Amino acid sequence: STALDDRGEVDIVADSFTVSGVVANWTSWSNGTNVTTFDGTNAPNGGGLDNDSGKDQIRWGQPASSYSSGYGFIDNDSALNGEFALNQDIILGTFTHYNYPVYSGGAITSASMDVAFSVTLTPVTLKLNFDHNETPNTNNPEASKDIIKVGNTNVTFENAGALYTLQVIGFRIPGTNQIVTEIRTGENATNSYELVVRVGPGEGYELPSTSGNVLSNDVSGADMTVVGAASGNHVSSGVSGSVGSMIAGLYGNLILLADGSYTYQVTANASSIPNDAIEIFTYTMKDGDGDTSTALLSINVNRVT
């Protein structure tokens, strides 16, 4: 028996939307005392400025020491330059969490924020949900921290008779790559996170991905089993292990099952996907006699308008 090289391909849209600047408004909430929505100011607890008259700051609580708790969102309009790229991590803005010590019972439990813009000029808005937990303050600073939780909301909109979906990915410690959907912040402290979003085609946002079976093309006479997979070309060696594990490539992840079934998800920003890109994996097969055999899985990653 001999395993034969396998060829797949996936498309990732690598175009760009002309978008206006974005305007954020905290529009709803539950259970605050002294809740104030306002456009950000250079006041001590005012959250800084932005290019809008929208209300991107929200505070609550009766300060017991100094400032009120609240949320901040400062749009990234200056650096986006009127553009939303597709299948690309987008910093929509910087979200800060102002955690100050506020008399028990003073906090909202939830709040929602709109983000509005136009797309050249189809106006569109993305709802942003937040569950909030202003914890009881104790001598345990880790337990005294407040948790925010953001939701993976989306909005689907039309453009040149075609559906696109913007979608919250999560929070990101700026300068890192880690996405979280829950924050924890010490009292008397703030916490600024990028708000990562992405927009792709369709009615929700789905990473590009392709599927197949590597053994369809392999040869034997009447039982084949995948026994190894790896990123790269490792035919000289052959490969053992990692069947049904998530295998990181250059551009995306692969999972190859023992029966030959694979799915590959392009996860990379498209800015990192060269033209004429090809993602190579190595598998090793085994027939019933016990004889190994190693081949390649070469998957084109194409860029489309």
Partner: peptide, 4 residues
């Protein structure tokens, strides 16, 4: 008394 208590804070949050």
């Amino acid at each position: 008394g208590y804070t949050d």
